[PDB]
């Protein structure tokens, strides 16, 4: 069952086989084995295929990489040609548009009924929305790309018959899809030309003379890719359409100033990025990666300017220039191309927008695609900085270990009484015995000379290997590694060249016994395969998969260390500055010579012996490789299978750590280092961490009467000196902090999902609003699943920002379009089936689809978008809100006498087993999902009957005031009342909330 | 008779008591001497607490040093010997004194491994980090020219020549940092990049009373088409602050200059 | 009555002579204890200062020390831990680095 | 005459013996007080030194299995 | 006469017995100093061992790090 969204890294190593079967030449993969390996049983009948042979009867033998062609297709493809799909997605367009105006309907009516509405009412509002949606640059291309996605999903579903081949002739472009592979025939004239007379794409695989006799009298060229680039391109087109529509809609409410950048600046940014990508290939994403740091630097400059406030922007600009001049000198760009390619960052730097607009612009970062990931480069990236020597200062390690022990002791003193009855000799701590005897703890000011004594403290096993009441951590249907005896069984057994001789097929106390006995060092429990990360703009990132017992050990260590430890290091005039440091680069920079004392102390804190140092004992003994299906490690044969050689994508001595694994211990060590810096340099430090970013705030404290100009400068200087001391300490510990990557700011704080400017929230909605798609991963393409995903996206979008209509209009556009896709083109059902005929027996008109799309889901219906949610995300009672929304909707239309025969329905034949599961809900099959004989026929029957449930009608028919929600309702109503009006334009002093004695 | 014997016995007893009195006096003298002689041990307690503190500190430090190091460590002699056979730093961590390895790196006579010196230099790079010069970028003439170009629209405009001449003058006078700071301050104020350039020209103390540079150009083809609208006859006393940027000497001797 | 008085005086004289002997023995014991008790005080006083000096010197010298990593600590520690309990060498094949 | 002088001499001898006994008791009490005063600090010093020596010897033994 | 002599002799004998008992008690109390003096000798002996082990570790340190 192929998916309709991007969820896997884009690897085109297998295409080398396809172009070998069609008699072409393509050097996609860096592994020479694929140049002469035996083709599989499939993707070899292409010699006997007639459609493919006829398709490739007018193209050169030499093909072209798809990295340089995706931006070309993103602009040269529009819907004018002929497609095999019978109901075109563009034919049911106006209806969708109509439905969108129906939320320029009731939503306005709902706000009017509540009392918010708007003081300024303009009659010319509906046609503005109609023109904004109709006059969208990425509208027809979006429909054509969705046609292509439907066609390729249908072709990939079969993959093993005559129905797996499809053809599209879109004006100047030809597309031939065969079983998870796609052939693009494009004109030569579209490709940008190198100064040598060849396309920029062909200079990477062919010499100048070689790519001049291969073409000769040929006007079209062919590029082979997987049926995954279609999904990526469809996603990019959908995201671009969504953001352009949102930007265009947002300006009609308040033309004076909106919270979104524009609908024209984003267009030229897209064009510049596409041109840069077309010129530079996959290597050009190094420059697209700079959209977010540049936006952050621009936001930082939207306040009072200090000499070090503009250092970040200067550093990012210098990095951009160096990267641009580095990946270009080898390439032979034309003089005009060398000037045109310097438009992306040139426009980004010269932007003049409010901080809110820049924060929104920050979100459009994956709109240009993702690079093709090679296992070789991904392996070398971690090998370059995970097996190198480090220089360590034992004094800094000693201070950090002492601070670690001191923090543990302080945490045990603050709670659970006081102290822990040290079972150590009292002479070794001459100066801590005074505090222990008096049952007092030494405060910060004088703990600089008695810090070393904290090394000599001994105690019983403070915590215990207990309180674990969640088995979900031990099994979640994720990916692990195979055993050592059968490790090459992951790779496809035709690229290997040999058949793998070996083929693959409780209790917590047992986990402890397995870990203690050093049984993870057994010869069959050492693989640690790599797997490439999902959609990212990096050159390539990977995460590790381990054998199952060692995975259980890792999860046990994580749980124990998060429960017992890791609580001593929490995630939390006077002027406070702050700076943000990166935590992911720490993962590969940890060596055993530095983490051994901390690990041993963690082991001693429990009754366990050797559980917390599983990684350092087992990782260096493992054989490091990327578990990709179509490219094994280089020079992998049958003879040297038990001891594979070290190739460009393999290595042995992984001395460092791995991202994610043992994260709590490393976070605790970083917090200990921060505390050591705080102890050495007498400033109040507050450190917090969120995933891969650690924000450290330094408080200065001033004697007052110092104005406010020099105060901020002094606070910034104190933060700078604290950052310098922390960099010194960390570098002495073996982890290098880059000086030219730290903000060192005062008001603008960026942390996790929250960016604040002088305490004012920076809106962000394009992160979630632009992800709304008519097709999602909803198990067998459930319509309710897609609708719920769109509803959650709308929830998150309305959670931030202050505009209501952009996201509402986007979701309204997408819901109807998704319903139409599911009705006409369903992957599970056979081709040509109409779900509006198999259930109703009559054409499913606009009336029934519009009526069934507004009844709320909690009432057993299909609506997930109610306006009361716009005021607050947390809803006390979904049922009453749904009843009120349905009542108000049916009151707006002159169809009031339908409310009663619409909510009663027929309760489902279920016992009292689901009433407990759903506290506030109804026992109706319509509100449920797939949470509750071949499986295909059963799934088809459930899908048909569920479709029958919807769109049918007349066939299945102290006090009571929560004071917590009243304030939220009042503030939300006030915000909605005055969102596009000037502060001085408010003519209302106070508002009275009078409730009616009826409910 | 009996009385004489009694008198003799009494005299003997009195003499005896005299000897025990002398013995008791000697005992008292010895006891008081022994009591008075115990002074130094009482005051020795002051110099043992400091020894305890220092020795406990040393023991803690070196115990942590050894326990963080595996059973494979290799001695200094072994480290040097196995450094003699190619670079290949020895298995197991090795201990060096900071000054010793610092002197070792500079003295290129005994072939210190490349990885060791790279790691040592990476360690030392953060030693010279202060409250200042932490996020300070290194700005060169080419980098400053590229930064200024990114704000000036169009190509071939006279302001590009102004940027080139200002970068050359800053490089010559070693004042690129001041120029960049002025440019950034003017841009933060909201002025156009052209306004920032003219403010820098009329504000930095280097530029006033400095002759614009001369350049030899064969023909009018070399100058870009955008600049052709701003060529004026060379004044007798040109001033860069007055507006002129640079002057062109034609191959036939014609005098012509550029003004903004 | 004279004989009884003579006997009593002789017994008293003998007892007081024994008292003399006991007092002399106590004097000798006290003198010996005083002489031998405080002999090594000077040597210990000299030794403590030197020990403190060398200890302070080395704890100060410990700060100026740089440690370079190596690719054998993990394997050596794993071998040590596997030898600590069920003292059989770890099973084949050989680990990353053997020395 | 003689008997009275003998009685006086015996009384004087008894008084001298009593005074000597009292002086000896006072000296014994003074010695006991001195010992009680001096018992503690040397014991504490010896205990500290013994602990420090044991810990240092353990550390050096741990170092020893490295060359 | 005789009675006074007998009384004086009895008093002298009692005083002599009391003095002998006091001397015996004094000697017994004095004889309890070796136990208190032994820790001094033990400390004097163990200072030498502590110095020896410290100097041994001093010599071992120079063998490990290069120094100059």
| DSSP state letters, B52-63 | HHHHHHHHHHHH
Residues with Cβ within 8 Å of A720's Cβ and at least 6 positions away in sequence, in order, are A308, A744, B131, B132, B134, B135
Query: Which token pair is A212?
Result: 């001049």
If one counts every other C-beta atom within 10 angstroms of the C-beta of residue A464, the result is: 13
- Expressed in percent and rounded to 5, the helix, strand and coil fractions of chain C are 70, 5, 25
List CB contacts (< 8 A) between B65 and chain A: 394, 398
Domain parsing of chain E, residue ranges = 1-68
Interface D:E, ≥3 CB–CB pairs < 8 Å:
yes
The response to whether A992 counts as a known ligand-binding position is yes
Query: Which token pair is A476?
Result: 């979640």
Which of B248, B210, B203 shows the shortest CA–CA distance to B230? B248
The technique is cryo-EM
Q: Which of A308, A430, A597 sits opposite B56 (nearest CB)?
A: A430
If one counts every other C-beta atom within 10 angstroms of the C-beta of residue A41, the result is: 8
List CB contacts (< 8 A) between E27 and chain D: none
Substitution target from E17, E27, E56 for chain C, most C beta carbons within 10 A: E27
Which of A677, A623, A626 shows the shortest CA–CA distance to A485? A623
Which of A606, A680, A698, A678 shows the shortest CA–CA distance to A408? A606
Q: Which of D42, D53, D66 sits opposite E49 (nearest CB)?
A: D53
Answer yes or no: do B56 and A428 touch at CB < 8 A: yes
List CB contacts (< 8 A) between C29 and chain B: none
Answer yes or no: do A452 and B126 touch at CB < 8 A: no
Q: Is E53 on the interface with D (CB under 8 A)?
A: yes
Give the count of alpha carbons within 13 A of A498, CB side only. Answer: 12
Residue A625 resides in a domain: yes
Residue A54 resides in a domain: no
List CB contacts (< 8 A) between A591 and chain C: 69, 73
If one counts every other C-beta atom within 10 angstroms of the C-beta of residue A738, the result is: 11
Cα(A279)–Cα(A201) distance, rounded to whole angstroms?
8
Secondary structure (H, E, C), A119-148:
CCCCCCCHHHHHHHHHCCCCCHHHHHHHHH
Residues with Cβ within 8 Å of B78's Cβ and at least 6 positions away in sequence, in order, are B90
- For chain A, the domain total comes to 1
Q: In what order do the strands lie in the sheet with A754-757?
A: A749-751, A754-757, A760-761
In a 3-state reduction of DSSP, which class is residue E60? Answer: helix
Answer yes or no: do B91 and C70 touch at CB < 8 A: yes
**Residue A277: φ, ψ to 5°:** -65, -45
CA dist list (Å): A126 to A117, A249, A872, B234:
16, 11, 27, 64
- What pairing do the DSSP bridges indicate for beta strands C66-68 and A391-392? antiparallel
If one counts every other C-beta atom within 10 angstroms of the C-beta of residue E36, the result is: 14
Q: Residue A851 is inside which H or E element, if any?
A: helix A846-852
Residue A691 resides in a domain: yes
Answer yes or no: do B98 and C13 touch at CB < 8 A: no
Cα(B179)–Cα(B204) distance, rounded to whole angstroms?
8
Query: Which token pair is A707?
Result: 């104005």
Which of A504, A610, A599, A492 shows the shortest CA–CA distance to A548? A504
**Residue C45: φ, ψ to 5°:** -60, -40
Q: Resolution of the coordinates in A?
A: 3.3
In a 3-state reduction of DSSP, which class is residue A760? Answer: strand
In a 3-state reduction of DSSP, which class is residue A683? Answer: coil
Residue A406 resides in a domain: no
Cα(C47)–Cα(C41) distance, rounded to whole angstroms?
10
Q: Is B30 on the interface with C (CB under 8 A)?
A: yes
CA distance B17 to chain A (A): 55
Q: Which long-range contacts (CB under 8 A, 24 or more apart) does A301-305 make?
A: A301/B188, A302/A354, A302/A355, A302/A358, A302/A748, A302/A757, A303/A747, A303/A748, A303/A757, A303/A758, A304/A712, A305/B184, A305/B185, A305/B188
Q: Which of B64, B131, B155 sits opposite A398 (nearest CB)?
A: B64
Q: Residue A531 is inside which H or E element, if any?
A: strand A529-532
Q: Is B234 exposed, middle or buried (0-12, 13-18, 19+ CB in 10 A)?
A: middle
- What one-character-per-residue DSSP string does A378-434 give? HHHHHHHTTSS--EE-HHHHHHHHHHHHHHHHHHHHHSSSS-----S-GGG-TTTHH
Cα(A905)–Cα(A858) distance, rounded to whole angstroms?
13
In a 3-state reduction of DSSP, which class is residue A780? Answer: coil
Cα(A300)–Cα(A298) distance, rounded to whole angstroms?
5
CA distance B81 to chain A (A): 19
Cα(A599)–Cα(A606) distance, rounded to whole angstroms?
11
Q: Which of B55, B73, B97 sits opposite E66 (nearest CB)?
A: B97
What secondary structure letter does DSSP report for A490? G
Surface of A (730-769) touching C: CB under 8 A: 734
Cα(D36)–Cα(D29) distance, rounded to whole angstroms?
10
Alpha helices in A281-352 (DSSP H): 285-288, 291-300, 311-326, 335-340, 344-349
Q: Residue B249 is inside which H or E element, if any?
A: strand B244-250
Answer yes or no: do C50 and E54 touch at CB < 8 A: no
In a 3-state reduction of DSSP, which class is residue A845? Answer: coil
Query: Which token pair is A49?
Result: 């295929």
8 A C-beta contact, residue A617 and residue A413: no
8 A C-beta contact, residue A792 and residue A769: no
Q: Is E57 on the interface with B (CB under 8 A)?
A: yes
Cα(A252)–Cα(A261) distance, rounded to whole angstroms?
14
Q: Is A591 on the interface with C (CB under 8 A)?
A: yes
- What one-character-per-residue DSSP string does A153-211 give? HHHHHH-SSGGGEEEEEETTEEEEEETTEEEEEEEGGGSPBPTTSSBTTTTTTS-TTHH
Q: Is E44 on the interface with B (CB under 8 A)?
A: no
């Amino acid at each position: 069952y192929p998916d309709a969204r991007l969820s896997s890294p884009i690897v085109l190593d297998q295409c080398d086989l396809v172009t070998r079967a069609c008699g072409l030449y393509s050097s996609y993969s860096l592994n020479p084995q694929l140049r002469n390996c035996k083709l599989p049983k499939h993707i070899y009948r292409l010699k006997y295929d007639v459609t493919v042979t006829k398709f490739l009867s007018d193209v050169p033998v030499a093909t072209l990489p798809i990295d340089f062609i995706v931006p070309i297709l993103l602009k040269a493809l529009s819907g004018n040609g002929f497609c095999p799909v019978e109901p075109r997605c563009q034919q049911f367009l106006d209806e969708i548009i109509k439905y969108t105006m129906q939320d320029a309907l009731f939503l306005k009516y709902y706000l009017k009924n509540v009392g918010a509405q708007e003081d300024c009412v303009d009659d010319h509002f509906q046609e503005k929305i109609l023109s904004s949606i109709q006059g969208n640059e990425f509208l027809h291309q979006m429909f054509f790309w969705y046609d292509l996605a439907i066609l390729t999903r249908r072709g990939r579903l079969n993959r093993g018959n005559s129905r797996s081949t499809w053809f599209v002739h879109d004006d100047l472009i030809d597309i031939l899809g065969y079983g998870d592979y796609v052939f693009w025939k494009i004109p030569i004239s579209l490709l940008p030309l190198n100064t040598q007379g060849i396309p920029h794409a062909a200079m990477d695989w062919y010499q100048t003379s070689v790519f001049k006799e291969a073409v000769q009298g040929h006007t079209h060229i062919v590029s082979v890719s997987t049926a995954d680039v279609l999904i990526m391109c469809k996603d990019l087109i959908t995201c671009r359409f969504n953001t352009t529509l949102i930007s265009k809609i947002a300006e009609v409410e308040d033309p004076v100033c909106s919270d979104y950048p524009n609908f024209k600046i984003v267009s030229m940014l897209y064009q510049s990025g596409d041109y840069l990508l077309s010129i530079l290939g996959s290597d050009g994403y190094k420059i697209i990666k700079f959209l977010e740091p540049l936006c952050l630097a621009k936001i930082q400059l939207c306040s009072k300017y200090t000499e070090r406030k503009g250092r970040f922007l200067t550093q990012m600009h210098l990095a951009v220039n160096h990267t641009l001049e580095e990946i270009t000198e080898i390439r032979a760009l034309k003089p005009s191309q060398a000037h045109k390619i310097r438009e992306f960052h040139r426009t980004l730097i010269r932007l003049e927008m409010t901080p809110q607009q820049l924060c929104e612009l920050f979100s459009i970062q994956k709109h240009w695609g993702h690079p093709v990931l090679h296992s070789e480069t991904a392996i070398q990236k971690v090998k370059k900085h995970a097996t190198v020597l480090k220089a360590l200062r034992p004094i800094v390690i000693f201070e950090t270990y002492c601070v670690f022990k001191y923090s543990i002791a302080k945490h045990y003193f603050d709670s659970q009484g006081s102290w822990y009855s040290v079972t150590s000799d009292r002479n070794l701590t001459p100066g801590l015995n005074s505090y222990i005897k008096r049952n007092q703890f030494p405060p910060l000011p004088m703990i600089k000379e008695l810090l070393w004594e904290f090394y000599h403290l001994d105690h019983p096993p403070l915590f215990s290997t207990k309180i674990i009441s969640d088995l979900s951590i031990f099994i979640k249907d994720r990916a692990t590694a195979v055993e050592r005896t059968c490790w090459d069984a992951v790779f496809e057994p035709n690229v290997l060249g040999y058949n793998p001789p070996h083929k693959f097929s409780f209790s917590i106390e047992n986990v402890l016994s397995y870990a203690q006995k050093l049984e993870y060092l057994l010869p069959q429990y050492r693989n640690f395969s790599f797997s490439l990360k999902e959609k990212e703009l990096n050159v390539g990132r990977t995460f590790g998969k381990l054998p199952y017992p060692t995975r259980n050990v890792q999860t046990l260590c994580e749980a124990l260390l998060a429960d017992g430890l890791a609580k001593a290091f929490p995630s939390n005039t006077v002027r406070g500055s702050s700076f943000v440091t990166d935590l992911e680069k720490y993962n590969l920079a940890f060596r055993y010579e530095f983490t051994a004392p901390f690990i041993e102390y963690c082991n001693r804190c429990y009754g366990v012996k050797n559980v917390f140092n599983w990684m350092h004992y087992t990782i260096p003994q493992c054989y490091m490789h990327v578990s990709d299906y179509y490219n094994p490690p280089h020079n992998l044969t049958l003879e040297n299978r038990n001891n594979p050689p070290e190739g460009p994508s393999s290595y042995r001595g992984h001395m460092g750590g791995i991202e994610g694994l043992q994260q709590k211990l490393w976070t605790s060590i970083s917090c200990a280092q921060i505390s050591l810096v705080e102890i050495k340099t007498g400033f109040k430090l507050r450190s917090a961490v969120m995933g891969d970013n650690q924000c450290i705030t330094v408080l200065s404290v001033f004697p007052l009467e110092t104005d406010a100009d020099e105060q901020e400068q002094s606070a910034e200087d104190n933060a700078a000196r604290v950052a310098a001391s922390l960099a010194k300490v960390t570098s002495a510990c073996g982890i290098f902090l880059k000086p030219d990557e730290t903000f060192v700011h005062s008001g603008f704080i960026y942390f996790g999902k929250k960016q604040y400017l002088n305490g004012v929230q920076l809106p962000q909605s394009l992160k979630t609003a632009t992800r709304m798609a008519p097709l999602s991963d909803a198990i067998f393409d459930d319509l309710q699943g897609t609708l719920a995903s769109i509803g959650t996206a709308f929830e998150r979008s309305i959670s931030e920002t202050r505009h209501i209509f952009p996201c509402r209009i986007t979701a309204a556009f997408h819901t109807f379009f998704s319903v139409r896709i599911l009705q006409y083109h369903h992957l599970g059902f056979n081709k040509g089936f109409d779900l509006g005929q198999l259930t109703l027996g009559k054409p499913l008109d606009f009336g029934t689809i519009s009526l069934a799309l507004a009844v709320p889901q909690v009432l057993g219906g299909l609506s997930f978008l109610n306006p009361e949610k716009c005021f607050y995300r947390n809803l006390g009672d979904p049922v009453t809100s749904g009843l009120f929304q349905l009542k108000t909707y049916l009151r707006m239309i002159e169809m009031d006498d339908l409310f009663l025969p619409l909510i009663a329905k027929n309760p489902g034949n279920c016992t009292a087993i689901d009433f407990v599961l759903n506290p506030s809900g109804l026992n109706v099959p319509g509100s449920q999902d797939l949470t509750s004989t071949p499986v295909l026929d059963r799934l088809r029957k459930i899908t048909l009957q569920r479709w029958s449930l919807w769109f049918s009608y007349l066939d299945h028919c102290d006090s009571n005031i929560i004071f917590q929600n009243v304030i939220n309702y009042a503030v939300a109503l006030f915000d909605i009342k005055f969102r596009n009006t000037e502060a001085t334009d408010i003519q209302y002093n106070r508002a009275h909330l009078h409730l009616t004695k009826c409910c | 008779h009996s009385f004489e014997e009694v008198v003799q016995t009494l005299a003997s007893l009195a003499t005896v008591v005299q000897q025990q009195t002398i013995a008791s006096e000697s005992l008292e003298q010895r006891i008081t001497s022994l009591e008075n002689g115990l002074k130094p041990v009482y005051d020795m307690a002051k110099t043992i607490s400091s020894l305890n503190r220092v020795c406990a500190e040393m023991v803690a430090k070196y115990d942590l040093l050894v326990m963080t190091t595996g059973r494979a460590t290799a001695t200094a002699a072994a480290t040097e010997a196995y450094w003699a056979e190619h670079g290949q730093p020895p298995p197991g961590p090795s201990l060096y004194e900071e000054s010793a390895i610092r002197g070792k790196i500079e003295s290129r006579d005994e072939t210190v491994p490349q990885s060791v010196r790279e790691a040592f230099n990476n360690l030392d790079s953060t030693t010279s980090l202060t409250e200042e010069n932490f996020g300070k970028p290194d700005i060169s003439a080419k980098d400053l020219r590229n930064i200024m170009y990114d704000h000036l629209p169009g190509f071939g405009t006279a302001f590009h020549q102004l940027v080139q001449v200002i970068c050359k003058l800053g490089k010559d006078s070693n004042s690129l940092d001041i120029i960049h700071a002025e440019f950034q301050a003017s841009l933060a104020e909201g002025d156009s990049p052209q306004c920032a350039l003219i403010q820098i020209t009329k504000r930095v103390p280097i530029f006033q009373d400095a002759a614009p540079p001369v350049i030899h150009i064969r023909s009018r083809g070399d100058i870009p088409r955008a600049c052709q609208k701003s060529l004026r006859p060379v004044p007798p006393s040109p001033k860069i602050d007055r507006g002129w940027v640079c002057v062109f000497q034609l191959q036939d001797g014609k005098t012509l200059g550029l003004k903004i």
